[PDB]
Amino acid sequence: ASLTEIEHLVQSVCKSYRETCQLRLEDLLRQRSNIFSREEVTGYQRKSMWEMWERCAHHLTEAIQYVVEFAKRLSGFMELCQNDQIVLLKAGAMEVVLVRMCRAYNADNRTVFFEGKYGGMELFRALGCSELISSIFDFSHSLSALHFSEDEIALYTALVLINAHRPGLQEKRKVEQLQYNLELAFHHHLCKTHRQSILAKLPPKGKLRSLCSQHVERLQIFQHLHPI
């Protein structure tokens, strides 16, 4: 593949991400000043775990839909067989949602954008998953320190999704080729933007798979979601 074909793959993945990012980065950074009051926080803490799970399940479903629309816009992904398209999405959609979350996370005050405003992890107290919520805040904190650009997120999440090691793949060689092309695109873009430094600072593939397992496991006990 030529240097123009790799630059086209970068451009494309970044466009596909811009078109499916849910909220613009600009709107998220602007809304950082819009923080929940102590009474609003109290309002969430008092809700039943069932009410909180119902709400969060709806927001997670809405987030997963944007991830599905992102994968569908990656020309290579659409050429794969339905067994492989299902395997990649089921194994990677939640990992992509977890990576995308760092954009709505503010490291200054350790808050997250939730239902129109920013709030801390105490907002999620009714769920009874303090360790699971802490894990999300810690992961978003370490990813936010990198100053992850929209294009870096686009290329990195395409790689989270297009992974040939996912057990259950029929056409493994087809997935390997798509993954190899995206790695070149990712490596080339980092060189062009002088952001080679972030590669070693990114989470190991295993760290992200383990985090996601915890979240999928707790999800089972509150529905039968599209990530379940």
Ligand SMILES: CC(C)(O)CNC(=O)C[C@H]1CN(S(=O)(=O)c2ccc(F)cc2)c2ccc(C(O)(C(F)(F)F)C(F)(F)F)cc2S1
């Ligand atoms: C803002 C964008 C466009 O960049 C990205 N979109 C999002 O942030 C998607 C969120 C959707 N929600 S959420 O809004 O309810 C939420 C938001 C922040 C959190 F710290 C936790 C939940 C969700 C629900 C359960 C969960 C869980 O991980 C959680 F309950 F938090 F443990 C679960 F899967 F275990 F249930 C995750 C999310 S992530």
